[PDB]
A paper describes a structure:
Cypoviruses, members of the family Reoviridae, subfamily Spinareovirus, possess a single capsid layer with turrets and are commonly embedded in crystalline occlusion bodies called polyhedra, which are formed in the cell cytoplasm and mainly composed of a single virus-encoded protein, polyhedrin. To ensure the delivery of virus particles to the target intestinal cells, allowing the transmission of packages of infectious virus between hosts by oral-faecal routes, polyhedra are disrupted only when they are exposed to the very alkaline pH environment found in insect midguts. The fold of all the polyhedrins is highly similar – a β-barrel core sitting on a base domain, surrounded by a common array of five helices (H1–H5). The strongest intermolecular interactions define a trimer composed of a cluster of three β-barrels sandwiched by helices top and bottom.
As expected from the 83% amino acid sequence identity, CPV18 looks very similar to CPV1. The exception is the polyhedrin of CPV18, which has >80% sequence identity with that of CPV1, consistent with their relatively recent divergence. In CPV18 purine binding is almost identical to CPV1 in that GTP hydrogen bonds with V2c and V1 while ATP is supported by two V4 regions from different polypeptide chains. The ATP and GTP bases stack with each other and with the phenol ring of Y172. There are two substitutions in the binding pocket, K154H and R155V. Residue 155 interacts via the main chain nitrogen, and is thus sequence independent, whilst at residue 154 both the lysine and histidine side chain NH groups hydrogen bond with ATP phosphates. Despite a strong overall similarity with CPV1 there is no pyridine bound in CPV18. Many of the key residues that bind the CTP in CPV1 (H76, N77, D78, S79, Y80, D81, D96 and R98) are substituted, including H76N and S79P, which interact with the phosphates and R98T which stacks with the base. Clearly these changes are sufficient to disrupt CTP binding. Although the two molecules are very similar (rmsd of 247 structurally equivalent Cαs 0.23 Å) they behave dramatically differently in alkali buffers, CPV18 being far more sensitive to dissolution.
Numbering used by the authors:
A (entry chain A), B (entry chain A), C (entry chain A): 1 to 248
The structure:
């Protein structure tokens, strides 16, 4: 005898490796492929809650003020005091917690999409603590289209995902949050027109969700992001992901 | 320069105020606007759980027997005994709780929609304790269309919302509950036909939800309803809401 | 005369009984009828979690690794240790629980549909512990169509439901799970084309859900399955259900 490895056009092992990676990249971008969304809530103790949803055609996550708060499973969370925090955040002077600022409040949110999203379809409702998009329902558009703010996460010249990050450093940064994006579809075949619409309804049923609180960004990077070939952007602006298209 | 306030057609401050209010009322009723649903569960201790959802195009809430039960966050809820209540309510003589009637059972339900709902589209599945609409699945239509029972909440001659209220005073009033309504659309443009269908799918992702148990109706009126310009109807048939159209 | 019972074509009581049963069977199969899905998670202590959803047009259930785990309401569940189990199952050697195998892990899953499902529409995402269908998102089709594996549950010659059962006997059988099916529609009228599409969106709102952990299969058979005329298949391959069509 056979040709020698890495010297000719008959390194079929090499060609197959490149195709395997290209096939995965392009399958993900096909209408048969996943589109995925991660919402990361960063807490002052360094821990990070991730909410993930993976689905065909479109994907979303919807959270309220309470559901974004840090919960340390199987440890003390002062649940009564934190309900009083909630009452005090839903209306000023509306509660009697033993604290001014709950350390269970997120300090920042990172939204990441898989590279298979179309950024023009991204929608976000970053609402107030009682789940209104813009102060009062009567004046609220139920979302903002924020795609232009999404940064490409590049690795080795390939877009491995998209990130929108915003800090919540101020005491009044008390939010509810929903996010939605639609899978790429450069064809003119509408996946939700009658020929395929019921499948999109089924995709709502079939969407897989994951949630966990990791003790720190290092642990998240190591045992979640890297383990499962997900894209990420850390606090030092370091990009993580696996470039696949046309690559060995 | 200038004319004197409140004496001529050049009180532009006055005209702008009236337009600001009219714009909010009419924006809410546009296809860009919210439709909102509140389900209030009233408990014997005077507290009130609210479940709220705010979304474009259509909105709904789905609860089971268990999820409607009173939960006092961070206080004693006798969770084992209340699981035995559940077993005893799912099937007669099916549990061994230390009580005949759980005070965590709702005594009444009020369903309120924003004025932007079309009442003809309202659907409710008030089912039994195991989440069947009408005793057995084989004979169950999955909803009832109850719009004709909805009372207008009028303030200053304007409809600020719609209410359907039913008490659960009897021991056998053990329910599951889902409710759905569609945003007004007097146009013939179908928001869920192919030109806009994927946006309606995204609205399912983007819908914002809120839940809280207020200690009493007074507190709910003060720190939830009134604070956020929501419609309400209290036990004394008093109407709450903010009239906007054509008004200063 | 009157004729004597059970001797002539004028036993109208008999004819009405047969029609009542036939009407229920056939109503369930009409587009006005329910389609229902049950996911049973079997634990080593003999208890069984059921997740049920009942809805018009289509129905689904989506669970993650954590949500399928046994929770004994109001009893000790060692929540910190079980969070460490989760960390250790999401990534090998990723936690520090006091055990090798959590007895809260399901030992098997049974998926049952009502007889009103079309088995060709059934879709399942049996994913890994972090909610990816097939190891990595890039290579994952978001479901498998498993209808050919569904066994008919026959009683008295009638199909009363469909079952797909799989054991999780191995230590590596750590899963996430979503399942979806569409209600029979032998007509060519698309329930999700524009004439009726918004109603299918409302059905997503209106779907009723039920969850409970029964202490054993006997109790489930007695107080859930049999009580509510649901189909079932027990560990000894015994079929349960109520035959209705053309029957008294
Ligand atoms: N492209 C390129 N890579 C370099 C160069 N010098 C060092 N490198 C390293 O080599 C890596 C790329 O190697 P290859 O993947 O085999 O080069 P390629 O350009 O992708 O060529 P093909 O994969 O054969 O199409 C990069 O990640 C660099 O870190 C250089 O001059 N050009
Ligand atoms: N319309 C009306 N309001 C009265 C009358 N007497 C007292 N009021 C009070 O005045 C309020 C309405 O005042 P306005 O809003 O300025 O009157 P309006 O009829 O709405 O007239 P415009 O807003 O200028 O179109 C009501 O809420 C009443 O409580 C009356 O005779 N007619
Ligand atoms: N069909 C049938 N059933 C039998 C026979 N012998 C005993 N059985 C029992 O009788 C039951 C059926 O009785 P029926 O429902 O009145 O008989 P059928 O065949 O359904 O007749 P129709 O309901 O009048 O149309 C079955 O469940 C059997 O357990 C037999 O020879 N033929
Ligand atoms: N020294 C080099 N000279 C020329 N081309 C390079 C070199 N290093 C990498 N490349 C190529 O340039 C392209 C971009 O790779 P690069 O490593 O810059 O991506 P990146 O990970 O986004 O970089 P960075 O994260 O440092 O901004 C790839 O096709 C890669 O093969
Ligand atoms: N004394 C009055 N004489 C004439 N018109 C009035 C008077 N008070 C209010 N109105 C007008 O009548 C219309 C209805 O207002 P009204 O206060 O009756 O509404 P409402 O809040 O539903 O009343 P209620 O709650 O007492 O049934 C409004 O346009 C208002 O400006
Ligand atoms: N002894 C019998 N002789 C003839 N027909 C019978 C007899 N028993 C039942 N049947 C009929 O045969 C058909 C199938 O009934 P059968 O009891 O076999 O269904 P099944 O409950 O699926 O049976 P199994 O569970 O034992 O496999 C029905 O129409 C029934 O009336």
């Amino acid at each position: 005898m056979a040709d020698v490895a890495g010297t000719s056009n008959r390194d079929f092992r090499g060609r197959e490796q490149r195709l395997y990676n290209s096939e995965q990249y392009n399958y993900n971008n096909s209408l048969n492929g996943e589109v995925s969304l991660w919402v990361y809530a960063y807490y002052s103790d360094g821990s990070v809650l991730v909410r993930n949803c993976n689905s065909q055609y479109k994907v979303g996550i919807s959270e309220c003020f309470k559901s974004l708060k840090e919960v340390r499973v199987g440890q003390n969370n002062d649940p009564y005091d934190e309900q009083e925090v909630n009452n005090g955040v839903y209306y000023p002077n509306g509660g009697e917690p033993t604290k001014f600022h709950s350390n269970a409040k997120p300090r920042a949110i990172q939204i990441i999409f898989s590279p298979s999203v179309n950024v023009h379809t991204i929608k976000m409702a970053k609402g107030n603590s009682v789940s209104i998009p813009k102060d009062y329902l009567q004046r609220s558009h139920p979302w903002e289209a924020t795609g232009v703010k999404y940064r490409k996460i590049h690795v080795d010249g390939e877009i491995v995902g998209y990130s929108h990050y915003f800090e919540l450093p101020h005491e009044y940064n008390s939010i509810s949050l929903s996010v939605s994006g639609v899978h790429k579809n450069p064809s003119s075949y509408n996946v939700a027109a009658p020929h395929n619409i019921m499948d999109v309804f089924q995709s709502c049923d079939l969407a897989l969700k994951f949630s966990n609180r990791y003790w720190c960004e290092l642990e998240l990077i190591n045992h979640y992001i890297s383990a499962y070939a997900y894209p990420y952007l850390d606090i030092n602006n370091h990009k993580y992901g696996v470039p696949l298209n046309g690559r060995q």
